[PDB]
Design an enzyme around this catalytic site. Sequence first.
Site, mmCIF file in Angstrom:
data_model
loop_
_atom_site.group_PDB
_atom_site.id
_atom_site.type_symbol
_atom_site.label_atom_id
_atom_site.label_comp_id
_atom_site.label_asym_id
_atom_site.label_seq_id
_atom_site.Cartn_x
_atom_site.Cartn_y
_atom_site.Cartn_z
ATOM 1 N N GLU A 35 61.802 -34.343 63.598
ATOM 2 C CA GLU A 35 61.274 -35.576 63.016
ATOM 3 C C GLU A 35 62.369 -36.617 62.791
ATOM 4 O O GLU A 35 62.168 -37.804 63.085
ATOM 5 C CB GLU A 35 60.572 -35.288 61.681
ATOM 6 N N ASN A 46 54.597 -46.819 63.809
ATOM 7 C CA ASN A 46 53.524 -46.262 64.623
ATOM 8 C C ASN A 46 52.688 -47.375 65.245
ATOM 9 O O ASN A 46 52.642 -48.502 64.749
ATOM 10 C CB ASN A 46 52.641 -45.339 63.777
ATOM 11 N N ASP A 48 49.608 -47.845 65.198
ATOM 12 C CA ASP A 48 48.551 -48.338 64.320
ATOM 13 C C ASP A 48 49.076 -49.215 63.192
ATOM 14 O O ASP A 48 48.285 -49.637 62.342
ATOM 15 C CB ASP A 48 47.743 -47.170 63.736
ATOM 16 N N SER A 50 51.180 -48.295 60.800
ATOM 17 C CA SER A 50 51.801 -47.520 59.741
ATOM 18 C C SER A 50 53.256 -47.241 60.109
ATOM 19 O O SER A 50 53.712 -47.561 61.211
ATOM 20 C CB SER A 50 51.040 -46.215 59.500
ATOM 21 N N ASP A 52 56.510 -44.164 59.520
ATOM 22 C CA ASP A 52 56.951 -42.836 59.106
ATOM 23 C C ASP A 52 58.316 -42.921 58.423
ATOM 24 O O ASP A 52 59.210 -43.625 58.898
ATOM 25 C CB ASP A 52 57.057 -41.898 60.314
ATOM 26 N N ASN A 59 53.989 -40.370 56.650
ATOM 27 C CA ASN A 59 53.354 -41.584 57.160
ATOM 28 C C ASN A 59 52.700 -42.398 56.049
ATOM 29 O O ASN A 59 52.086 -41.848 55.132
ATOM 30 C CB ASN A 59 52.320 -41.215 58.225
#
Length: 129
Positions: A35, A46, A48, A50, A52, A59
Amino acid sequence: KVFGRCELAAAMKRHGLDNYRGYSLGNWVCAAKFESNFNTQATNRNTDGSTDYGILQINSRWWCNDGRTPGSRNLCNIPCSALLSSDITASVNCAKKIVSDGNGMNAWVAWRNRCKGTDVQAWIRGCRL
Ligand SMILES: [Cl-]
Ligand SMILES: [Cl-]
Ligand SMILES: [Cl-]
Ligand SMILES: [Cl-]
Ligand SMILES: [Cl-]
Ligand SMILES: [Cl-]
Ligand SMILES: [Cl-]
Ligand SMILES: [Cl-]
Ligand code: NA
Protein backbone atom coordinates in the site's frame (compact mmCIF):
# COMPACT_ATOMS: atom_id res chain seq x y z
CA LYS A 1 8.14 8.49 8.52
CA VAL A 2 9.42 5.53 6.50
CA PHE A 3 9.39 2.48 8.76
CA GLY A 4 11.74 -0.41 8.55
CA ARG A 5 10.12 -3.80 8.03
CA CYS A 6 10.79 -5.17 11.52
CA GLU A 7 10.28 -1.73 13.09
CA LEU A 8 6.75 -1.60 11.64
CA ALA A 9 6.01 -5.19 12.65
CA ALA A 10 6.93 -4.30 16.24
CA ALA A 11 4.79 -1.14 16.20
CA MET A 12 1.83 -3.06 14.76
CA LYS A 13 2.21 -5.73 17.45
CA ARG A 14 2.39 -3.14 20.21
CA HIS A 15 -0.86 -1.61 18.94
CA GLY A 16 -2.66 -4.97 19.00
CA LEU A 17 -2.75 -5.79 15.31
CA ASP A 18 -1.02 -9.18 15.44
CA ASN A 19 -3.71 -11.84 14.81
CA TYR A 20 -6.43 -9.14 14.91
CA ARG A 21 -9.56 -10.73 13.39
CA GLY A 22 -7.33 -13.74 12.79
CA TYR A 23 -4.85 -11.99 10.47
CA SER A 24 -1.25 -12.70 11.45
CA LEU A 25 1.28 -9.90 11.74
CA GLY A 26 2.85 -10.81 8.41
CA ASN A 27 -0.44 -10.12 6.61
CA TRP A 28 -0.48 -6.59 8.04
CA VAL A 29 3.18 -5.91 7.18
CA CYS A 30 2.68 -7.28 3.66
CA ALA A 31 -0.35 -5.04 3.14
CA ALA A 32 1.56 -1.99 4.40
CA LYS A 33 4.48 -2.84 2.09
CA PHE A 34 2.39 -2.78 -1.07
CA GLU A 35 0.00 0.00 0.00
CA SER A 36 2.65 2.54 1.09
CA ASN A 37 6.17 1.00 1.00
CA PHE A 38 6.05 1.62 4.78
CA ASN A 39 5.73 5.43 4.33
CA THR A 40 3.27 7.01 6.77
CA GLN A 41 3.00 10.09 4.52
CA ALA A 42 1.77 8.22 1.40
CA THR A 43 -1.31 9.69 -0.32
CA ASN A 44 -2.94 8.57 -3.56
CA ARG A 45 -5.98 10.00 -5.32
CA ASN A 46 -8.66 7.64 -6.60
CA THR A 47 -10.61 7.98 -9.84
CA ASP A 48 -13.82 8.58 -7.87
CA GLY A 49 -12.28 11.65 -6.21
CA SER A 50 -11.59 10.03 -2.85
CA THR A 51 -8.04 9.81 -1.50
CA ASP A 52 -6.09 7.03 0.25
CA TYR A 53 -3.98 7.99 3.29
CA GLY A 54 -1.08 6.56 5.24
CA ILE A 55 0.73 3.27 5.77
CA LEU A 56 -2.42 1.26 4.99
CA GLN A 57 -3.89 3.69 2.39
CA ILE A 58 -7.20 4.19 4.20
CA ASN A 59 -9.81 5.75 1.93
CA SER A 60 -11.75 8.98 2.47
CA ARG A 61 -14.92 7.59 0.85
CA TRP A 62 -15.81 5.75 4.06
CA TRP A 63 -13.26 6.04 6.82
CA CYS A 64 -11.85 9.54 7.38
CA ASN A 65 -12.72 13.17 6.67
CA ASP A 66 -10.63 15.21 4.24
CA GLY A 67 -13.28 17.82 3.38
CA ARG A 68 -13.16 17.18 -0.36
CA THR A 69 -14.84 13.77 -0.92
CA PRO A 70 -18.50 14.55 -1.70
CA GLY A 71 -21.06 12.23 -0.19
CA SER A 72 -18.47 10.38 1.87
CA ARG A 73 -18.51 9.15 5.46
CA ASN A 74 -16.00 9.40 8.31
CA LEU A 75 -16.57 6.11 10.11
CA CYS A 76 -13.25 6.18 11.98
CA ASN A 77 -14.17 9.71 13.19
CA ILE A 78 -10.76 11.19 12.35
CA PRO A 79 -9.27 13.74 9.95
CA CYS A 80 -7.51 11.88 7.16
CA SER A 81 -4.38 13.88 8.05
CA ALA A 82 -4.19 11.89 11.31
CA LEU A 83 -3.44 8.84 9.16
CA LEU A 84 -0.13 10.40 8.00
CA SER A 85 1.45 10.74 11.46
CA SER A 86 4.73 9.11 12.41
CA ASP A 87 2.68 7.55 15.25
CA ILE A 88 0.65 4.74 13.70
CA THR A 89 -2.06 4.64 16.42
CA ALA A 90 -4.76 6.31 14.29
CA SER A 91 -4.07 4.10 11.26
CA VAL A 92 -4.14 0.94 13.39
CA ASN A 93 -7.37 1.84 15.20
CA CYS A 94 -9.07 2.65 11.90
CA ALA A 95 -7.74 -0.49 10.21
CA LYS A 96 -9.28 -2.53 13.04
CA LYS A 97 -12.68 -1.10 12.09
CA ILE A 98 -12.07 -1.68 8.37
CA VAL A 99 -11.03 -5.31 8.75
CA SER A 100 -14.12 -5.96 10.92
CA ASP A 101 -16.52 -4.55 8.30
CA GLY A 102 -17.35 -7.92 6.74
CA ASN A 103 -14.81 -8.81 4.05
CA GLY A 104 -11.72 -9.07 6.24
CA MET A 105 -8.50 -7.89 4.65
CA ASN A 106 -10.02 -8.12 1.17
CA ALA A 107 -11.00 -4.49 1.84
CA TRP A 108 -7.37 -3.80 0.81
CA VAL A 109 -7.36 -4.72 -2.88
CA ALA A 110 -3.55 -4.87 -2.83
CA TRP A 111 -3.64 -7.36 0.06
CA ARG A 112 -5.96 -9.62 -1.96
CA ASN A 113 -3.83 -9.30 -5.07
CA ARG A 114 -0.31 -9.45 -3.58
CA CYS A 115 -0.46 -10.94 -0.06
CA LYS A 116 -3.44 -13.31 0.18
CA GLY A 117 -2.33 -16.92 -0.03
CA THR A 118 1.39 -16.11 -0.06
CA ASP A 119 4.06 -16.88 2.53
CA VAL A 120 3.28 -13.76 4.56
CA GLN A 121 5.43 -14.96 7.47
CA ALA A 122 8.43 -13.90 5.35
CA TRP A 123 7.53 -10.29 6.17
CA ILE A 124 8.26 -10.80 9.90
CA ARG A 125 11.04 -13.39 9.52
CA GLY A 126 14.15 -12.52 11.50
CA CYS A 127 12.44 -9.76 13.49
CA ARG A 128 12.84 -9.54 17.26
CA LEU A 129 9.17 -9.49 18.24
CL1 LIG B 1 11.03 -4.59 2.90
CL1 LIG C 1 0.86 -12.70 14.37
CL1 LIG D 1 2.85 -13.99 9.82
CL1 LIG E 1 -15.75 15.33 2.45
CL1 LIG F 1 -19.72 9.30 9.14
CL1 LIG G 1 -11.99 16.31 10.47
CL1 LIG H 1 3.98 4.17 16.25
CL1 LIG I 1 -11.90 -12.90 7.74
NA1 NA J 1 -14.86 11.08 4.13
